[PDB]
Amino acid sequence: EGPLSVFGDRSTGETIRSQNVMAAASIANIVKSSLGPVGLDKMLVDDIGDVTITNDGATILKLLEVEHPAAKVLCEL
Amino acid sequence: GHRPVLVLSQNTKRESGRKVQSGNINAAKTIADIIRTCLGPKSMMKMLLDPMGGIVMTNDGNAILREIQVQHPAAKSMIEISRTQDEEVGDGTTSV
Amino acid sequence: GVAFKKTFSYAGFEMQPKKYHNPKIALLNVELELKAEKDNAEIRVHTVEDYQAIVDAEWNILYDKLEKIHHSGAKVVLSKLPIGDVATQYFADRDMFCAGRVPEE
Amino acid sequence: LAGEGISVNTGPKGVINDWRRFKQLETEQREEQCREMERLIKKLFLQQYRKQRMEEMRQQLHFKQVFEISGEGFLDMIDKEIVIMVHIYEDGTEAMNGC
Amino acid sequence: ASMGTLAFDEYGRPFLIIKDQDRKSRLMGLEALKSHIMAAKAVANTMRTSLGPNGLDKMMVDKDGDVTVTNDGATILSMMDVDHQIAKLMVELSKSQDDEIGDGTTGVVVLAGALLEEAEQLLDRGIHPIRIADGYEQAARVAIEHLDKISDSVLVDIKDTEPLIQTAKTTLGSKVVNSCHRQMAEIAVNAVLTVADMERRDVDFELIKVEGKVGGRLEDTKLIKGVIVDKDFSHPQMPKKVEDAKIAILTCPFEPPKPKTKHKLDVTSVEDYKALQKYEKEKFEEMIQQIKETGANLAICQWGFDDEANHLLLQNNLPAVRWVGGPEIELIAIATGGRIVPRFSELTAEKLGFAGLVQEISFGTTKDKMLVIEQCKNSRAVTIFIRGGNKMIIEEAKRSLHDALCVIRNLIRDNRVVYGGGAAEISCALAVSQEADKCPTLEQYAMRAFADALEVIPMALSENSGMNPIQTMTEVRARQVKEMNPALGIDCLHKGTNDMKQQHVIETLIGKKQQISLATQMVRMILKIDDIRKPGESEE
Amino acid sequence: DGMITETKGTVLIKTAEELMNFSKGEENLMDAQVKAIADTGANVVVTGGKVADMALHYANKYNIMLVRLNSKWDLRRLCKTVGATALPRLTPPVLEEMGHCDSVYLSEVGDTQVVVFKHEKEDGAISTIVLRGSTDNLMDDIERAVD
Amino acid sequence: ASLSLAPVNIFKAGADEERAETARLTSFIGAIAIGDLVKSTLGPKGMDKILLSSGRDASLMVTNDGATILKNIGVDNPAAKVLVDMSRVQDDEVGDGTTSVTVLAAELLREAESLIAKKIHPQTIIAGWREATKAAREALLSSAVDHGSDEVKFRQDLMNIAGTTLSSKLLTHHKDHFTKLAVEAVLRLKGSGNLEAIHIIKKLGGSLADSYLDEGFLLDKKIGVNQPKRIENAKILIANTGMDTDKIKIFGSRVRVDSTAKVAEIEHAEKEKMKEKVERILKHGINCFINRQLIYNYPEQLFGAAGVMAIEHADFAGVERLALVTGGEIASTFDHPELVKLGSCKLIEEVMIGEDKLIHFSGVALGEACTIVLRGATQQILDEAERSLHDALCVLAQTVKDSRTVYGGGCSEMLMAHAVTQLANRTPGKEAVAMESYAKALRMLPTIIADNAGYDSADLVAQLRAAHSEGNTTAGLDMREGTIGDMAILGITESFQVKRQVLLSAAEAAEVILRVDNIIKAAPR
Amino acid sequence: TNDGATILKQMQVLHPAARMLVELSKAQDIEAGDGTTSVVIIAGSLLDSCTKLLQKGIHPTIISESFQKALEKGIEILTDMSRPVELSDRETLLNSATTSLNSKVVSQYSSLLSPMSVNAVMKVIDPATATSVDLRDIKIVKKLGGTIDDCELVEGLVLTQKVSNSGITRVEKAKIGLIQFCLSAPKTDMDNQIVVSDYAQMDRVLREERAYILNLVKQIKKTGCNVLLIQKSILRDALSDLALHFLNKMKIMVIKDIEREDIEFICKTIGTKPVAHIDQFTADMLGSAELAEEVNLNGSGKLLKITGCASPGKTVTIVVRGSNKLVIEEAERSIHDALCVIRCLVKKRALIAGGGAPEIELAL
Ligand SMILES: Nc1ncnc2c1ncn2[C@@H]1O[C@H](COP(=O)(O)OP(=O)(O)O)[C@@H](O)[C@H]1O
Numbered sequence A: 001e002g003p004l005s006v007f008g009d010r011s012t013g014e015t016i017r018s019q020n021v022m023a024a025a026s027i028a029n030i031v032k033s034s035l036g037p038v039g040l041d042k043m044l045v046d047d048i049g050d051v052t053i054t055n056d057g058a059t060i061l062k063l064l065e066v067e068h069p070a071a072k073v074l075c076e077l
Numbered sequence B: 001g002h003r004p005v006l007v008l009s010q011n012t013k014r015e016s017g018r019k020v021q022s023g024n025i026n027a028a029k030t031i032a033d034i035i036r037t038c039l040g041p042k043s044m045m046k047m048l049l050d051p052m053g054g055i056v057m058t059n060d061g062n063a064i065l066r067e068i069q070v071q072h073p074a075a076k077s078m079i080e081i082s083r084t085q086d087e088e089v090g091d092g093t094t095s096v
Numbered sequence C: 001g002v003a004f005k006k007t008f009s010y011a012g013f014e015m016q017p018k019k020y021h022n023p024k025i026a027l028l029n030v031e032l033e034l035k036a037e038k039d040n041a042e043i044r045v046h047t048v049e050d051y052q053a054i055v056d057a058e059w060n061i062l063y064d065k066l067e068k069i070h071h072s073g074a075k076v077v078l079s080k081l082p083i084g085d086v087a088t089q090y091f092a093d094r095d096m097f098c099a100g101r102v103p104e105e
Numbered sequence D: 001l002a003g004e005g006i007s008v009n010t011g012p013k014g015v016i017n018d019w020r021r022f023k024q025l026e027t028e029q030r031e032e033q034c035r036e037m038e039r040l041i042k043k044l045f046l047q048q049y050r051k052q053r054m055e056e057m058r059q060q061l062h063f064k065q066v067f068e069i070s071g072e073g074f075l076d077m078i079d080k081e082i083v084i085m086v087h088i089y090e091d092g093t094e095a096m097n098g099c
Numbered sequence E: 001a002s003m004g005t006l007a008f009d010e011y012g013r014p015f016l017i018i019k020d021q022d023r024k025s026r027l028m029g030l031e032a033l034k035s036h037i038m039a040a041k042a043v044a045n046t047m048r049t050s051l052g053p054n055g056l057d058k059m060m061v062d063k064d065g066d067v068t069v070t071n072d073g074a075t076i077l078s079m080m081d082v083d084h085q086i087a088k089l090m091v092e093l094s095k096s097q098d099d100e101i102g103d104g105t106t107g108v109v110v111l112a113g114a115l116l117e118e119a120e121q122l123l124d125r126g127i128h129p130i131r132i133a134d135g136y137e138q139a140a141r142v143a144i145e146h147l148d149k150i151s152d153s154v155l156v157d158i159k160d161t162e163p164l165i166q167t168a169k170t171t172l173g174s175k176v177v178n179s180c181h182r183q184m185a186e187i188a189v190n191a192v193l194t195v196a197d198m199e200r201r202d203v204d205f206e207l208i209k210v211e212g213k214v215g216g217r218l219e220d221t222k223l224i225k226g227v228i229v230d231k232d233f234s235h236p237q238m239p240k241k242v243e244d245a246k247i248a249i250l251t252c253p254f255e256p257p258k259p260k261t262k263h264k265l266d267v268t269s270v271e272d273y274k275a276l277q278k279y280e281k282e283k284f285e286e287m288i289q290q291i292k293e294t295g296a297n298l299a300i301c302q303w304g305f306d307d308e309a310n311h312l313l314l315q316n317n318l319p320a321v322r323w324v325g326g327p328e329i330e331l332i333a334i335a336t337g338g339r340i341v342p343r344f345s346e347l348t349a350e351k352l353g354f355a356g357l358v359q360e361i362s363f364g365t366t367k368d369k370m371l372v373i374e375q376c377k378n379s380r381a382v383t384i385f386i387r388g389g390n391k392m393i394i395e396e397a398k399r400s401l402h403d404a405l406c407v408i409r410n411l412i413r414d415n416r417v418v419y420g421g422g423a424a425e426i427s428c429a430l431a432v433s434q435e436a437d438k439c440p441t442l443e444q445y446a447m448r449a450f451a452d453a454l455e456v457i458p459m460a461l462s463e464n465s466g467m468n469p470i471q472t473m474t475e476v477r478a479r480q481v482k483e484m485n486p487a488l489g490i491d492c493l494h495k496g497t498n499d500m501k502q503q504h505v506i507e508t509l510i511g512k513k514q515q516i517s518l519a520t521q522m523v524r525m526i527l528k529i530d531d532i533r534k535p536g537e538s539e540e
Numbered sequence F: 001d002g003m004i005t006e007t008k009g010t011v012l013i014k015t016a017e018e019l020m021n022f023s024k025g026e027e028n029l030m031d032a033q034v035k036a037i038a039d040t041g042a043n044v045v046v047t048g049g050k051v052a053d054m055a056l057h058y059a060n061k062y063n064i065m066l067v068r069l070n071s072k073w074d075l076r077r078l079c080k081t082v083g084a085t086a087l088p089r090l091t092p093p094v095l096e097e098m099g100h101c102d103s104v105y106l107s108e109v110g111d112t113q114v115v116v117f118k119h120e121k122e123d124g125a126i127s128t129i130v131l132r133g134s135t136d137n138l139m140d141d142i143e144r145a146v147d
Numbered sequence G: 001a002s003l004s005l006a007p008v009n010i011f012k013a014g015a016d017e018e019r020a021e022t023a024r025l026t027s028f029i030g031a032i033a034i035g036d037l038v039k040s041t042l043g044p045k046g047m048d049k050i051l052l053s054s055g056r057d058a059s060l061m062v063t064n065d066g067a068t069i070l071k072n073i074g075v076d077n078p079a080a081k082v083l084v085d086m087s088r089v090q091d092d093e094v095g096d097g098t099t100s101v102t103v104l105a106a107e108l109l110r111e112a113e114s115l116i117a118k119k120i121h122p123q124t125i126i127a128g129w130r131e132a133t134k135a136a137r138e139a140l141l142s143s144a145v146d147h148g149s150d151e152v153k154f155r156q157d158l159m160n161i162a163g164t165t166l167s168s169k170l171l172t173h174h175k176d177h178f179t180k181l182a183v184e185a186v187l188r189l190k191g192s193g194n195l196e197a198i199h200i201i202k203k204l205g206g207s208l209a210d211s212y213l214d215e216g217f218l219l220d221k222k223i224g225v226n227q228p229k230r231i232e233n234a235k236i237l238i239a240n241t242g243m244d245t246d247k248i249k250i251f252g253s254r255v256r257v258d259s260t261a262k263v264a265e266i267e268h269a270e271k272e273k274m275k276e277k278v279e280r281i282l283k284h285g286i287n288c289f290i291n292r293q294l295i296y297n298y299p300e301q302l303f304g305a306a307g308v309m310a311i312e313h314a315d316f317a318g319v320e321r322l323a324l325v326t327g328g329e330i331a332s333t334f335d336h337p338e339l340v341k342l343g344s345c346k347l348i349e350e351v352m353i354g355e356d357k358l359i360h361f362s363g364v365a366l367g368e369a370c371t372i373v374l375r376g377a378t379q380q381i382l383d384e385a386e387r388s389l390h391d392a393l394c395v396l397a398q399t400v401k402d403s404r405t406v407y408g409g410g411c412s413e414m415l416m417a418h419a420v421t422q423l424a425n426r427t428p429g430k431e432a433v434a435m436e437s438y439a440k441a442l443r444m445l446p447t448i449i450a451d452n453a454g455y456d457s458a459d460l461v462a463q464l465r466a467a468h469s470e471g472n473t474t475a476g477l478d479m480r481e482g483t484i485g486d487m488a489i490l491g492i493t494e495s496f497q498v499k500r501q502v503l504l505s506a507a508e509a510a511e512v513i514l515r516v517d518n519i520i521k522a523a524p525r
Numbered sequence H: 001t002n003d004g005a006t007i008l009k010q011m012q013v014l015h016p017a018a019r020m021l022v023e024l025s026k027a028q029d030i031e032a033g034d035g036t037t038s039v040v041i042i043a044g045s046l047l048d049s050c051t052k053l054l055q056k057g058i059h060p061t062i063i064s065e066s067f068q069k070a071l072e073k074g075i076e077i078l079t080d081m082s083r084p085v086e087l088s089d090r091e092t093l094l095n096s097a098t099t100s101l102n103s104k105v106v107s108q109y110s111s112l113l114s115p116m117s118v119n120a121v122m123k124v125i126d127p128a129t130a131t132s133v134d135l136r137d138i139k140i141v142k143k144l145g146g147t148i149d150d151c152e153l154v155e156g157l158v159l160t161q162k163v164s165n166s167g168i169t170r171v172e173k174a175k176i177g178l179i180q181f182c183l184s185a186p187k188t189d190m191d192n193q194i195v196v197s198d199y200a201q202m203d204r205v206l207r208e209e210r211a212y213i214l215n216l217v218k219q220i221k222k223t224g225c226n227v228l229l230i231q232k233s234i235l236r237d238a239l240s241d242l243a244l245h246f247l248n249k250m251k252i253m254v255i256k257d258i259e260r261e262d263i264e265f266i267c268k269t270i271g272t273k274p275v276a277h278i279d280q281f282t283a284d285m286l287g288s289a290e291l292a293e294e295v296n297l298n299g300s301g302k303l304l305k306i307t308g309c310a311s312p313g314k315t316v317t318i319v320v321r322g323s324n325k326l327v328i329e330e331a332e333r334s335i336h337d338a339l340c341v342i343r344c345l346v347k348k349r350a351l352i353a354g355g356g357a358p359e360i361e362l363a364l
């Protein structure tokens, strides 16, 4: 709302930077527990009962549903 | 308006820690206890109700396990190993 | 010193002087108006003379309080409790300042 | 687009029949809603009663039934003609009904 | 850039900080300042057209549909149903200007709007708002000192009321009552001078009664050196006119006495009943005779009375008025020089007020009667009776006369004046620019913005009068610079001269100082807000 | 305050003189009561009920400190810690019923106005621990530790 | 930028504002709508209106009065509210001229709209209108003629004024009869301005010509059971006492005894007190007793036993009217009979009007109070007749108060506009155009008067303008046939006060409406 | 109903013209009493003609003036057709009443109702020196049961109030007395209480209340009164049980709950002067009557009749009987129409032929 007159939300300043860093930290913390010989695998359930037990980061980030585009950037990375 | 902004999509649950291990182990224990009594020469038979309307009255462990539906993925893994034992050697499905 | 807002002056207040050069202030917690002596007080009379005497006694009680205040030598009167129009006019006739409902603080 | 001072004049004159026919039903609906909402929303060893048992087995000494009310039934039961208790339920209800 | 924050934790767990944070809205940084500046600019631009003699009125409608046509800035802002917080701040600024001064309630809003408009550009050039506020404060101090320098004193003597009449006329020029311009100025000046403590003390407006009755003409408004009452004589057969009346002001109803304490009078025999009825009759006769004994020709009560007392008053030739309000009782006592007596026992001749004429007034084919008490000896209370063709112009005349009374009160408090028409604003802007030219660069922009904001008032006056704002203001400023004369303003009335001293456009110095101050601190307060936290629910 | 009847109190006035003298007599009687209380050397008065305005006036006239305790538990604890007996009427206290404290004063701690009943001897029936902190929850936890 | 047309929203939900062009448009539309509605009910050939209330009772009203039409309509336009309040104040000040002032204000505002369209600042229009109002007021004042010195001429002027006032109403069918009735009723007031001293009684049935002004007075009250129904040479005492379970006013008094015999004694004492009060009243030597309040069974029985007629429950207006018509004094104490004046009249009896019975006072002493019996075929007819008679009585009372009169039929407006034009062609600038528009509205008033009759309004108005140009200052609209003629001969007279008030109120309302350049409405409740 | 005014009033019409015609019918009923349908028909026909007149290009002001001229001419023509009539001619009055009743349901019962109406009007007015008839002097009482043939012309008064003295009816040579005070325990307008602080005081209280009631009853009886009518009282009990018992023991009929609005009619009919205090209750304020009997209407109710009074008043009462309520109301309306017709004969005593003859003569 204002004189900009765009049908959408706008974020500026430290807010958007904090949001991007929060998304990156969330993506990192998703797979941070599966690093090194003392890492552990993860179950992934595909909403229909299909189970995918894996430790590979690429598989985990591919199977996950991601909405924030910075998180998408990390998944594509 | 202003649908909320968040990293992962909605209805995307995530558990972690000792709770996950405890849940998996209890699910396996429940699977074992389902057919614990169907082992040995003095085993008692069980009646399974097929969703299609049939009746499966059997003593085999794999036949009992494959006729039930579970939500916990650990129970799914246990049913899968039961099927694997049934296919590989033909018996020992409840022992495993 | 102290300053506070004017508190709902009654009729006849504007006739009082609004400046004194060495006033004596009678800080009071007293209801200076005609009212029942007590909420549980009942007057029982059977003669018109006693009726008139009771009315005059109420008026004399109020006027005795006012006369004591006036003869105290004070020129400014402040009371926590309400000060009625009768008392306000009485003080106006004596070139006295009155103000009721003054807050505790 | 001007002339906001319409002065509708005899326009509504030719529609009083239909307007009043609709208004009668509208008023009836408003009255029914008010009566419905009158109750709702508004607020939506002596200690052991030794006499309870004696009242219990002296009450059984009389068996008819409570009237089952029809939206306008609730309206016209209280609109005409004393203390009245009305029970609201849809089929613990049976116990208090027996009470 | 709003709706608070939305993180939901780095681990996906719920992150609830503030209650109902999902619907609360917040605005931060320069965006909030820009929004506030835009809102204040909108309010100021709306109020701009109601400035000067050629200013136009606003027709306000309240919740109930009642219609108010007015030019007063404070009244207009009060009637508005605004939701923006900055708009409420400007409304409070107008109310403060009205309370302290009573005139200039529209100039403050325009000045604040101009100040914030200039602050918008200053912020866009990359200056901290605190620096802008400091520069505004310094420029305001300079302008106030300059106003003190160029101020002129007037005489506030009763013998010569010409400057007071000129000031009242200048105040009333913008209002609709300018059809009776000098008449209203004269009556306002006389009203203020009558009820006033001479030693520059307060002027109590409770001694000025303003009443308006429809009908007649606006020119029929007159000053009554007495009290006019909405009541009339109690008995229809009482005479309608009393001359040389000896008023008897009373607060006791003409009824048998009744103790305040709850009581019971026991009647136990027929003799008791006879004594009771004889006592009632004797009490009535005694109160009437006590009233008569003082020689009073008229009695004014407050709590009414009953039929026996009314007929006894009529029989003894004593006109009487009942149910007179307490303020009216006090005003009558003050004007007539009489005391207020609480009971007939204390009434005496020395406590009787004197009035030259007490009359009952008719108002055409309306049956409405009003009593007028006038021709008092040394009346220290006055009333103003306003007539008109409709109640709306009556209310507008009421507030215009109130503005005139406030202006004369300010003149009584301090007699220093400055010449209006934008001359004072132009001189202040020139002084501010001269001070800025001799100052470090950083606050020079703030000072020059303050001067430009001061320049809006002559621009508004010229635009409202149909002249070109920039050209006329530039010519007047150049003339002021050329010949040292801070009395050159904007010829709104097209009288052919720019010298406001000759045109007698006079306004109080205190009014201008209060305008500049209140605008400066209000703009400073607005500029210092960098964050808004609104519920955003938009409830019914 | 002057004690009242328990069934129902009605001031029956039959003559003007009684009406004039009633309030003056009541004020004089309660003045006598308060002066009798003060003549025993008492200088601090603690009450569990309300305080009459005129009683407060006459206690101020005689330089008597007034403290009001709403909860009966606080009254009992104060009686234990001072050595006084909770009297049921306005009678002046006898020598054995008069409590003694080393110092009683009004003081402010932080932003809280408190009344302190302070002893000098390292003894008594009741002792109080004053807890300070930057958070209410922290003080509650410290109180649990103290318990 | 404006409040509404800004990126930020500054208003509550439901509040709005209208800037210069929109506010002027709305105000002009509302004022012109009011003027067009109230007009066509103007002049001798004006029609009536039907006011059909939409409420539960659904009151039906037929009226020609502009004020009653304007007050009984749901108005949302604020300028229309201003005009309605103008009409109400016009009615309050004088009886007649509501339609005239409303139409004049509407025409002035229409001319103002045209001038604004001509790119003229409203302040210039206001200044020009002030000058034109001054000129027109001076011209009308100079045109006024006074006839208060001559009694016969003053009575003729009163007759002419009453006829002119009634010419536009439903009473114009019997204009002579109602004119004489109203003139006699006003003259019976003997200079008193209290129109409440004249009572209008509406009785259904009978023709409108059956209405009459009673030679005495009429009361719609009853008489006691055992009291005479006819008294000759009555001596009337008017009172405002209780005489109904009369209680001693000591509110704290009560009866407290130990036996019922004492209670019976106290009851007998109360009855004896009432009897003594009745005896004191009778000591005045009266035949008819009138009390403002109710009279209970015992006092009325006592009155009947004494052969004295007692009329009860005659309200404040009733007792005032009887005091005015008979000369008695309203008394509340009866201890000094010699100090109370008793009303006198030749005869009191009961008359049979319609199906109702009324008390008739005949041969009254003073008679400074009148009762008018209105007979009609419908309730609407009676109400409209009462309103028209009220207007006529108000105008006649105003003329009695101030005897200065002007000529109607558009003559006054024609001379006003002639003076305005003479001023306008003597002034430079657009103020001349504003004054010309003022004159055009003044012309439009009799133009509408002529249009209501279907006459050639343009030609008649041109003839009137020419005639006033040569110097014929008495020419007007002769409505009998559709020509122009001398209103001094035709006797179309009208009060100077009414015309002055119409002019000044219309100018004032037009000025206050024209000053508005912004309409701001709060959120409706 | 057949009355035009009643039909118009009963049905809401919602149109201003229709409401004005309703008011016109009401005014015609007020001024004349009958012809309420004819006037509405005339107005409708006149406006129907005005439609074609307006469609011809005629202004609706020449129409009004021409209609006024036609009305004046028609009034003159009708006055020409008039025939003088004297109230002493009973035949003309009977014919007028019969013509009025011809159009109603009681037309069959005309030989009973038309003489009834003529007698009712003649008995309440002076036959000479009279200019109007106050129809409020002719009381109409509607009692269900029977037929229209059972209508009566009681020359006294009938009261629907029942006799509280259950056991005494049909008092002959009655001396009726009307009182407006209450026969109960003493009570003053000023509020009163009796304080008892002794059992002897209790005994004295009830004994003295009984004695006071007995004294009141004895004072009433000493005047020779045998029929007592008591005005309705709401403030305090008008007739106590003890007072009723004493009055019954004195052999006096007691009629209570008399409405305040009927006091004037009762006093005019009988001759009783109301009494509001026992001090003024004397024999000369009693209304002598030949008989005062309460009769039953074949199980349809009870009516108290006082028939035959010394110095009778100028009031009559008509009792209307019928099978059901509707025919009773219509009979009452028809009788009112006949009475109004005779009243129209009383003032402006001129008679014209009916049958549409005046209308066709006016047309020609
Ligand atoms: N006759 C005049 N000629 C020129 N300017 C004037 C005249 N009268 C008033 N003004 C100016 O118009 C400005 C606005 O005055 P006004 O609208 O009456 O009250 P407010 O100051 O509240 O807007 C004042 O600052 C004054 O200088």
Ligand SMILES: Nc1ncnc2c1ncn2[C@@H]1O[C@H](COP(=O)(O)OP(=O)(O)O)[C@@H](O)[C@H]1O
Pocket (backbone or CB within 6 Å): G041, G042, G043, G044, G046, G066, G096, G097, G098, G099, G100, G163, G164, G165, G166, G167, G168, G169, G408, G409, G410, G449, G477, G478, G479, G492, G494
């Ligand atoms: N007989 C007449 N001849 C010419 N003009 C008339 C006549 N009677 C009234 N008028 C004019 O009609 C105008 C309106 O009068 P009217 O409609 O009666 O009341 P109002 O002034 O309230 O509209 C008056 O200004 C008057 O000049």
Ligand SMILES: [Mg+2]
Pocket (backbone or CB within 6 Å): B091, B092, B093
């Ligand atoms: Mg096996």
Ligand SMILES: [Mg+2]
Pocket (backbone or CB within 6 Å): E103, E104, E171, E174
């Ligand atoms: Mg101003």
Ligand SMILES: [Mg+2]
Pocket (backbone or CB within 6 Å): G096, G097, G165, G166, G168, G391
């Ligand atoms: Mg008129």
Ligand SMILES: [Mg+2]
Pocket (backbone or CB within 6 Å): H034, H035, H100, H103, H337
């Ligand atoms: Mg008929």
